[PDB]
Amino acid sequence: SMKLVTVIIKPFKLEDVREALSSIGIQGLTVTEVKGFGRQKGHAELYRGAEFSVNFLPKVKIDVAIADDQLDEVIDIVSKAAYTGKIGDGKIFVAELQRVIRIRTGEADEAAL
Amino acid sequence: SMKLVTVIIKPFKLEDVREALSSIGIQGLTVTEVKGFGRQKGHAELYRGAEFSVNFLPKVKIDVAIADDQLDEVIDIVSKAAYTGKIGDGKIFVAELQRVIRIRTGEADEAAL
Amino acid sequence: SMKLVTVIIKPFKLEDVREALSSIGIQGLTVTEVKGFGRQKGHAELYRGAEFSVNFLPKVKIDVAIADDQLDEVIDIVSKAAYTGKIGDGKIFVAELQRVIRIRTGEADEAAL
Amino acid sequence: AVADKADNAFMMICTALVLFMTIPGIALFYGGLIRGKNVLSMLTQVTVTFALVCILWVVYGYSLAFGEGNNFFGNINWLMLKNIELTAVMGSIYQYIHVAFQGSFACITVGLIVGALAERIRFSAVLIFVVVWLTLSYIPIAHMVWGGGLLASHGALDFAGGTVVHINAAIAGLVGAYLIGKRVGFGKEAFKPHNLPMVFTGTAILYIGWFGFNAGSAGTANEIAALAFVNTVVATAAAILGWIFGEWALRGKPSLLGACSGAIAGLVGVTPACGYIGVGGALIIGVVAGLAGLWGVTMLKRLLRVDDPCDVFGVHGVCGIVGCIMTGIFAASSLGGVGFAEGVTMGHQLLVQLESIAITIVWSGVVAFIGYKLADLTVGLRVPEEQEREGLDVNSHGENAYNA
Amino acid sequence: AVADKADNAFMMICTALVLFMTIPGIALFYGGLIRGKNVLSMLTQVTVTFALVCILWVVYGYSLAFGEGNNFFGNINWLMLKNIELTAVMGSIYQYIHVAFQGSFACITVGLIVGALAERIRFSAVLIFVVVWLTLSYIPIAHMVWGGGLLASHGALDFAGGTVVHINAAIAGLVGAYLIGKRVGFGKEAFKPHNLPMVFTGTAILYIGWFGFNAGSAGTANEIAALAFVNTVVATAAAILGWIFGEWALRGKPSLLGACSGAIAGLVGVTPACGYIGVGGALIIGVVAGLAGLWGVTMLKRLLRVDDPCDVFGVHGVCGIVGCIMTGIFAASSLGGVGFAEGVTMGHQLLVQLESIAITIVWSGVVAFIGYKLADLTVGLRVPEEQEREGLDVNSHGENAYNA
Amino acid sequence: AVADKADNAFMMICTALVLFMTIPGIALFYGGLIRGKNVLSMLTQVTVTFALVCILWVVYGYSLAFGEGNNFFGNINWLMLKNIELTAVMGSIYQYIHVAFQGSFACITVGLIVGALAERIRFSAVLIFVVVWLTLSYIPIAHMVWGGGLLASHGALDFAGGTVVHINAAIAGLVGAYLIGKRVGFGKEAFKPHNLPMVFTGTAILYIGWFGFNAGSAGTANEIAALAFVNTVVATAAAILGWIFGEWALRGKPSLLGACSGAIAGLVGVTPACGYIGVGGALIIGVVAGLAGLWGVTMLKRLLRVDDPCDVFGVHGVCGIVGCIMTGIFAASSLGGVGFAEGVTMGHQLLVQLESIAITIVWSGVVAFIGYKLADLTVGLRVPEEQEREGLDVNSHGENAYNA
Numbered sequence A, B, C: 001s002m003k004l005v006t007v008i009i010k011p012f013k014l015e016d017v018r019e020a021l022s023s024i025g026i027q028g029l030t031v032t033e034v035k036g037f038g039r040q041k042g043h044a045e046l047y048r049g050a051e052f053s054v055n056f057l058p059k060v061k062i063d064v065a066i067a068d069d070q071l072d073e074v075i076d077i078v079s080k081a082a083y084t085g086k087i088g089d090g091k092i093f094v095a096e097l098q099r100v101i102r103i104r105t106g107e108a109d110e111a112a113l
Numbered sequence D, E, F: 001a002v003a004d005k006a007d008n009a010f011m012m013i014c015t016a017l018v019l020f021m022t023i024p025g026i027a028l029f030y031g032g033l034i035r036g037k038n039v040l041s042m043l044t045q046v047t048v049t050f051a052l053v054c055i056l057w058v059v060y061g062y063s064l065a066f067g068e069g070n071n072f073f074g075n076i077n078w079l080m081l082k083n084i085e086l087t088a089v090m091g092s093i094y095q096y097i098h099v100a101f102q103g104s105f106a107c108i109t110v111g112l113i114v115g116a117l118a119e120r121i122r123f124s125a126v127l128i129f130v131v132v133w134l135t136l137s138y139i140p141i142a143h144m145v146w147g148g149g150l151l152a153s154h155g156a157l158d159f160a161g162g163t164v165v166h167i168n169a170a171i172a173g174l175v176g177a178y179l180i181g182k183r184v185g186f187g188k189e190a191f192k193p194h195n196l197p198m199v200f201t202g203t204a205i206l207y208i209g210w211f212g213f214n215a216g217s218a219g220t221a222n223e224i225a226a227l228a229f230v231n232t233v234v235a236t237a238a239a240i241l242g243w244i245f246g247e248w249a250l251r252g253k254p255s256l257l258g259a260c261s262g263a264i265a266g267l268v269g270v271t272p273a274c275g276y277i278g279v280g281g282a283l284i285i286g287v288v289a290g291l292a293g294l295w296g297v298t299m300l301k302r303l304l305r306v307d308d309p310c311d312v313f314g315v316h317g318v319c320g321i322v323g324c325i326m327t328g329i330f331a332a333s334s335l336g337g338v339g340f341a342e343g344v345t346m347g348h349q350l351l352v353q354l355e356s357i358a359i360t361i362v363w364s365g366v367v368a369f370i371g372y373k374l375a376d377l378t379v380g381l382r383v384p385e386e387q388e389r390e391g392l393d394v395n396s397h398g399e400n401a402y403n404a
């Protein structure tokens, strides 16, 4: 009944996604710089004689632990906020968390967030 | 019965957390530089006329795959080692791993670690 | 029936692993720069009077969401492609994904990839 | 008459120092101030405009700037430096050295402009603009001030180029920034400098090269070069402290970027003044320029509602205006300066300074407008939005700056 | 008498080169050696102390250093450079150039100190300290050695400032490091240099500017400038190899930071010596200084149990002492040097050198102690622990260096 | 006869500028072009070879290069600069300055080589190679061209070192790259430059120092220094535009690395020519060298099937050959040059240039082969594959460049 929601988005959508999450009482989260490959692909790069036709795109990955009761709303609020309609907008992944602990206090689950 | 333990901590606690893990026979793990938002928030930054009142904090994320029998001890040993008592000490997350494989040998589960 | 496959590999094996995945119809994935500790350990480093005998190794972490029907083949194709036989080749982890959504279209599961 | 080898030596080294201000000083300064996905576009724009200016200068620019002609331009007698004997002397140096030294001023002036255009300008548009603006703005203003034209004939004081360089560039940049419009994300997204140590390195190089710029404007290793050198030290130091204390007092903290910006503010302010004023004048110009720059990038920027990402106008325009005006005060003998010219009062000098400033602003502004419109009509000024989001380096240049 | 324009030219360019050593050389050198969260504090400290020193130098420092007075300080006749005619000559150059050249030495000396204080000092405390220490340590030691005071009157040899610059700074830094205490995490946490290419860039700039520092200390473009120049090349190269071979032999690998540190060790060692010794002397001083520096940052550092993050003492103090002593050997005619003064033996010169070193250490140490205590009583020397953990850039300066 | 202090001044500053080209220019240039795990190996190789060359130069190199001897080497009369009076004059400067100035050429020449060896060479092998190659290739070719030997006696024109520096280094590098073989991953893996702003910074410093290199090769601050200075500006600018327009036209985009490479191509091309040709000649040499360099790193590189990671041969070898040939055209009076020597026709000069080029290529190639074989027999040229995969910085040097 705790979920980890992972969101891979265009880096410029991060603020919009954060504001949307804070608007529903979610301000705590973790962000990672990642490199993305998919339908959207990088331009070719050239360095003197060297040609590189396969290149990653920078993306941002948000990991946010939430309660199961917030999941549908999170998905909806994040989808809207991250949306541009152009290829590469990214993905939402959802997995179960067996445990979530706040190191400082030892609180668990909803109380750890 | 394999678990992935994720720990998001203050970067200066990394060595302490590593030593605590090695002390119980856990030396293998993976570390990622991440940016954290939560109760603990970044100072304002100013660049000429530009003011930024919302800023991330650098954090370290440890991912360590373990056996289910090590979980409670890991949680306890990591919590102690990462603890400072000040806001921002971070979180432990636990999820199930369906499979863990050592690429080199093909060993699985406990034998892959 | 959706899986997240995580692969931690030597960075120079990334292209080989990508080509192997594309060869079975998997071109979409996310890559993170990570630091690894395990059986393979970093050389000592010295900076004037300061000696550092414990050092991480750079690794690449691939996260790829797939259908359950692709799992065994992915594992096999990735293991071959990432293999060097020397210590430090890395690990495959597999976890369940409860949901996978394409933000742009709202497609789910196999249709989100 | 005869070249003094001491002056030849000094002036060749001063030229290298001014060239250093562009390559790499201004490139790193602006490069660090913008985002990582756009750094190479700044470096490439500076490098390729530099090359273009160098060529246009030797083909016709030097002739039209420094040749005798009318109040507004020179002549075409020195096309490709034809008709200049290798042993020809200008002042106390070989004329060829004068060509290089003045060419280096053209280069830094143009490099300064591109900071206003950063992150959304089309590369080919910059090159077209530069050709128009160098030819019709830099060359005539240089002629008017330093090549014996209109402003010189009125006794304007501008030792090293408050008008010719700083105001001239700042206005071209400002007009550019208005015409191309605000970056996508402007009011909502965060544009932090991607690399402040890079900005500091650029600042440092600009500062060191500026001794060539200011002291070399004496044309000889004499006491006026020495005066200008010391005034450059003092004015820069005073502006750093002016800015820092303003910032610390009004915003709560002294900052690296503040200290760098103060340095530049002082260097700009003392540029017109350095060879006419005393050290107490340099100190005062410095403090004032530092505080004027701070106002320029904070309150004035908000007033203008323009996106000038590197604050070219707020520093170079504001501080160039301050410096040009203060030069007409601090040149006075009674204030430790070298003295007004025969028959000139402080009031009369201030009027001449204000007139020179006004003419520079309108002239550069009108010419810049024409250049940018030509670029817009031929190639288009602004890149498409999605190229801007991805960054100009990959889209305009096919390269990423930092590869792991 | 009359200024030689060749000397004016040389000395203005030498001054720019010394200024380059601080802005940006020493800033990047120390900046790269510390952690990323603290880089901007180092850059800001160097930049703002630089500005402060420049101002204090022209207000009173130059007068009190170089004016005629007693054994310990000069006078206040040249306050704000009043009473110095623009055409006044000092040696064979305009005095204004002498003011700038000696002011640049004050700047680098102060920049050197801050490497000892890195990562836990309060910014305002640095500024207060600098005012005290520049005024009461740098100025009197400069006067004693180069302004005709006590040590000069005893015939001390110090061509470019083994005492005035390197030992003076190193002791101020060391006392600072003892007083503020060890960084949090000191014995348990890893402090690796955050950017070694940045350290290398700083090293390179320090090296290039050092030609201005060493050769300009001749005051003229003569044969002694030439001697000093060549001795600088040789001593630096010898120290790089000395350090590298020591490191390679004793620790198993030749390192980038070792090669950079060796360069600095040689430059420091040859500073007092460069215009008095022959090239074989420079080679020997170099090798010795390189190995002495290596000892200084390894075995001596462990002995002292002090946290001097940039090893200011281990390089500048140790190598400055070595150089000052070796100058009293290698100045001998029989060893290829320029010769001892009339009536002076090697033994007598060595005693004078040791006396000069001793006086510098005590004088700087006592004054530094007073400055740091004043700072501690007014603003507090050391930042709170949590500011130190987060890093000084965000806390003292409101900026992050690298923004993605 | 008597030293001119203006020339002494100019030539000491020119020497500092050439030293700047190596420390840090070429180190950063090549350092940015390679991968992050190998950057420190490039910086350390440049720094430690620099130190070694400086020492070998003063011990015997200068004597054997510039002493009177035979067609191929000088003598050992100036070992450790013994027998050179401090007041000895060479041309119009103190001989000690000549020693330093020519020593700085030795340094940059050797620094240039290491870009060909990057990422898989053993550090100790580089040092052994350098000792052999400096002694038996650089010294005799310098003697042959500039020390009154064989090529000078035939009236070769090479003002600042198209043969002695650029071709000499490029061939040593190319032979090195063939002998050690291709990096692991060569045809399959991506080698992008790790830091293009670092490459740009190195380019800029190389450019600025090159004024010392080219203008100082006049030996005096006279009209030929002035000519060389202006030709350096023009040729560099022309090559940047040549390369950029070639790249833009043929590949679709103007690039930062293209603009930097064009700059270097022009500087190389104009090196032999700069003090013999007119400005129109410099423009043409520039455009040609720019396009020749572009060909050199694209089509020629593919033809040669060699792994020269920094394209030392494609730029320095190709453009040095172009420049050496074009010097024999553009020296003509009728083409604005200074004129052929008495009794010399264009056809005869071209033959002399081609002969000089041929001799340099074979001489350097044979000597380089011997040095690399000695290194291979003593320490082994190439590091083991797993050290190469991990990177040379950790394995050869015990350091990581960037620590978070």
Ligand SMILES: Nc1ncnc2c1ncn2[C@@H]1O[C@H](COP(=O)(O)OP(=O)(O)O)[C@@H](O)[C@H]1O
Pocket (backbone or CB within 6 Å): A008, A035, A036, A037, A038, A039, A040, A041, A057, A059, A086, A087, A088, A089, A090, A091, C028, C029, C030, C031, C063, C064, C065, C066, C102, C103, C104, C113
């Ligand atoms: N199967 C996958 N597993 C993990 N990450 C993926 C997968 N497919 C795509 N991604 C990530 O999503 C990003 C966008 O994918 P893309 O196919 O380009 O756009 P869209 O999601 O709009 O179809 C990629 O850059 C990559 O980081």
Ligand SMILES: Nc1ncnc2c1ncn2[C@@H]1O[C@H](COP(=O)(O)OP(=O)(O)O)[C@@H](O)[C@H]1O
Pocket (backbone or CB within 6 Å): A028, A029, A030, A031, A063, A064, A065, A066, A102, A103, A104, A113, B008, B035, B036, B037, B038, B039, B040, B041, B057, B059, B086, B087, B088, B089, B090, B091
């Ligand atoms: N709901 C969440 N999901 C994922 N990461 C989180 C969440 N809440 C906090 N974090 C991470 O934990 C870190 C500490 O959170 P914070 O609320 O500041 O401290 P504490 O855990 O001590 O209450 C954050 O910087 C962030 O990286």
Ligand SMILES: Nc1ncnc2c1ncn2[C@@H]1O[C@H](COP(=O)(O)OP(=O)(O)O)[C@@H](O)[C@H]1O
Pocket (backbone or CB within 6 Å): B028, B029, B030, B031, B063, B064, B065, B066, B102, B103, B104, B113, C008, C035, C036, C037, C038, C039, C040, C041, C057, C059, C086, C087, C088, C089, C090, C091
């Ligand atoms: N228990 C673990 N949990 C998470 N990551 C691990 C674990 N053990 C190893 N790793 C990762 O796998 C990498 C390789 O481990 P190592 O033991 O060196 O090689 P091998 O997998 O070939 O035995 C490490 O660098 C680390 O990133």
Ligand SMILES: CCCCCCCCOC1O[C@H](CO)[C@@H](O)[C@H](O)[C@H]1O
Pocket (backbone or CB within 6 Å): D064, D068, D069, D070, D072, D073, D074, D075, D076, D135, D136, D139, D140
């Ligand atoms: C500022 C650039 C615009 C002018 C370009 C045309 C220059 C030719 O204008 C001219 O040059 C001299 C002007 O005093 C005179 O010799 C002649 O009037 C005329 O030939």
Ligand SMILES: CCCCCCCCOC1O[C@H](CO)[C@@H](O)[C@H](O)[C@H]1O
Pocket (backbone or CB within 6 Å): D369, D370, D373, D374
């Ligand atoms: C080479 C052409 C130079 C002269 C261009 C004159 C045309 C002016 O261009 C214009 O000016 C305005 C800018 O305020 C725009 O808003 C108008 O839409 C546009 O007509």
Ligand SMILES: CCCCCCCCOC1O[C@H](CO)[C@@H](O)[C@H](O)[C@H]1O
Pocket (backbone or CB within 6 Å): E064, E068, E069, E070, E072, E073, E074, E075, E076, E135, E136, E139, E140
């Ligand atoms: C080192 C700084 C401390 C001294 C500050 C006070 C300086 C004023 O001290 C003085 O200057 C000269 C000293 O020889 C003399 O003219 C007089 O004795 C005195 O007026």
Ligand SMILES: CCCCCCCCOC1O[C@H](CO)[C@@H](O)[C@H](O)[C@H]1O
Pocket (backbone or CB within 6 Å): F064, F068, F069, F070, F072, F073, F074, F075, F076, F135, F136, F139, F140
């Ligand atoms: C290029 C380096 C190889 C030569 C090293 C040996 C140098 C000694 O060779 C010599 O020097 C002079 C040559 O003209 C002459 O004085 C003598 O022939 C001989 O003593």
Ligand SMILES: CCCCCCCCOC1O[C@H](CO)[C@@H](O)[C@H](O)[C@H]1O
Pocket (backbone or CB within 6 Å): F369, F370, F373, F374
């Ligand atoms: C100090 C020794 C220098 C002379 C070395 C001569 C030996 C040549 O070495 C060789 O040359 C070939 C390179 O094409 C290799 O392929 C051969 O295997 C090897 O015998």
Ligand SMILES: CCCCCCCCO[C@@H]1O[C@H](CO)[C@@H](O)[C@H](O)[C@H]1O
Pocket (backbone or CB within 6 Å): D303, D304, D305, D306, D317, D318, D321
């Ligand atoms: C030293 C330079 C001082 C210049 C002060 C200019 C004041 C600008 O003021 C303004 O300009 C804006 C356009 O940018 C307009 O939109 C505003 O209506 C107008 O108030």
Ligand SMILES: CCCCCCCCO[C@@H]1O[C@H](CO)[C@@H](O)[C@H](O)[C@H]1O
Pocket (backbone or CB within 6 Å): D329, D332, D334, D335, D346
């Ligand atoms: C922009 C307005 C500037 C006003 C000038 C104020 C400076 C003081 O005013 C003046 O300065 C000199 C006294 O030192 C006198 O020579 C002048 O006659 C007097 O006008």
Ligand SMILES: CCCCCCCCO[C@@H]1O[C@H](CO)[C@@H](O)[C@H](O)[C@H]1O
Pocket (backbone or CB within 6 Å): D171, D174, D175, D178, D304, D305, D306, D361, D362, D365, D366
């Ligand atoms: C030579 C100096 C030229 C000054 C040009 C001033 C152009 C003002 O332009 C105005 O700018 C405002 C701020 O963005 C906009 O809101 C207005 O729509 C626009 O017309």
Ligand SMILES: CCCCCCCCO[C@@H]1O[C@H](CO)[C@@H](O)[C@H](O)[C@H]1O
Pocket (backbone or CB within 6 Å): D124, D127, D128, D131, D378, D379, D380
């Ligand atoms: C010195 C001036 C430099 C001129 C740069 C040439 C820029 C050519 O750039 C081009 O212009 C066309 C017009 O939109 C486009 O259609 C082409 O795609 C594009 O290559």
Ligand SMILES: CCCCCCCCO[C@@H]1O[C@H](CO)[C@@H](O)[C@H](O)[C@H]1O
Pocket (backbone or CB within 6 Å): E303, E304, E305, E306, E317, E318, E321
């Ligand atoms: C060239 C300079 C040589 C100086 C050698 C000094 C030897 C220091 O030695 C020591 O200093 C420590 C304080 O730091 C004390 O705690 C130790 O008790 C004492 O042994």
Ligand SMILES: CCCCCCCCO[C@@H]1O[C@H](CO)[C@@H](O)[C@H](O)[C@H]1O
Pocket (backbone or CB within 6 Å): E329, E332, E334, E335, E346
């Ligand atoms: C710190 C101790 C240094 C001791 C000095 C050793 C140097 C050799 O000793 C000496 O050198 C010269 C011979 O070249 C002579 O002029 C001196 O008389 C002699 O003392």
Ligand SMILES: CCCCCCCCO[C@@H]1O[C@H](CO)[C@@H](O)[C@H](O)[C@H]1O
Pocket (backbone or CB within 6 Å): E171, E174, E175, E178, E304, E305, E306, E361, E362, E365, E366
């Ligand atoms: C002018 C030179 C001043 C030298 C000051 C020496 C101060 C020694 O101070 C000592 O340092 C030790 C090492 O950290 C500590 O353990 C001791 O408690 C402390 O008293």
Ligand SMILES: CCCCCCCCO[C@@H]1O[C@H](CO)[C@@H](O)[C@H](O)[C@H]1O
Pocket (backbone or CB within 6 Å): E124, E127, E128, E131, E378, E379, E380
């Ligand atoms: C040239 C000397 C520079 C002086 C810098 C002024 C530093 C003022 O700094 C301050 O000092 C007070 C005392 O603790 C604090 O309470 C204030 O919060 C703080 O602003």
